[PDB]
Design a protein around this ligand. Structure first.
Ligand code: DAO
Ligand code: DAO
Ligand code: CL
Ligand code: CL
Lengths: 153, 153
């Protein structure tokens, strides 16, 4: 991944987000409700030290689980680390959309986050543009009804 | 779907094809190996009367089944009917790629077929252009190894 947000101000990503689209290098990373990278972002909670707490939903064992993880800052404002993985922030306008990618050490999943439960065509175009450079083999997007449901069911 | 092949000569689609990419209006139409529209085209066998016999693979009950169906001609050269559905041929150059869609009566799945087990970037661009007009919520594509395996496993 060679696209990062220049000048990212992590404090201004605080608050509510919706996983409007997802994409991944391998079909099995997103194909089932219980696939490893099928994660629905709910809320971003930046810390004063500049770590990113993430609230998300994940389907585990026929149930939509509410989950929490800390992404630790690095020397690069647009790149965080997660234990189990790099999180890279590609692009955001803070008020409407955020594009990000997660990568292990060849598995890659990226999302288009939006602030409201609405299909934002401009944000999906930028998402689409950013993926043109990436070896993606699965793409999902969700309608506004799914965006307001637990695990987008 | 409002894109059909003007002047389609059904006889010249005869022979070998590979399902390089698939897309569908609903995630559950393509998300599992056993999803209803997860069909891998193998061979097209036009009949003299101008019907289209289709050989395809489908994963049923932990097994890759070899299957056969007849798409009946209509008054439109680019549109066929299948019992269980309209099949529409959007675009083909006969020698390299064929784009088609299947629709019931709101469910819609489209494929990019190629002649050889190769990622044809030009054909994927046209596939991408044709889908811009369609309400797709899932896209898959397959690498050359998967293209040469039963059910693209
Ligand atoms: C602005 C960055 C958004 C990052 C969201 C990443 C989601 C973390 C998912 C971790 C997977 C898991 O813990 O099961
Ligand atoms: C040029 C047209 C290509 C058409 C291929 C259609 C595939 C048919 C799949 C039917 C589904 C089923 O019978 O289970
Ligand atoms: Cl999209
Ligand atoms: Cl594609």
């Amino acid at each position: 991944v060679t696209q990062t947000m220049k000048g990212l101000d992590i404090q201004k990503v605080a608050g509510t987000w919706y996983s409007l689209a997802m994409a991944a290098s391998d079909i099995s990373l997103l194909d089932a409700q219980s696939a490893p990278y099928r994660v629905y972002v709910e809320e971003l909670k930046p810390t004063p030290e500049g770590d990113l707490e993430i609230l998300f939903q994940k389907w585990e064992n026929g149930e939509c689980a509410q989950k929490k993880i800390i992404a630790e800052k690095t020397k690069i404002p647009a790149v965080f680390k997660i234990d189990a993985n790099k999180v890279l922030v590609l692009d955001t306008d803070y008020k409407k959309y955020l594009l990000f990618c997660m990568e292990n050490s060849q598995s890659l999943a990226c999302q288009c986050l939006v602030r409201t439960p609405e299909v934002d065509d401009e944000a999906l175009e930028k998402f689409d543009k950013a993926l043109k450079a990436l070896p993606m083999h699965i793409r999902l997007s969700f309608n506004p009804t799914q965006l307001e449901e637990q695990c987008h069911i």
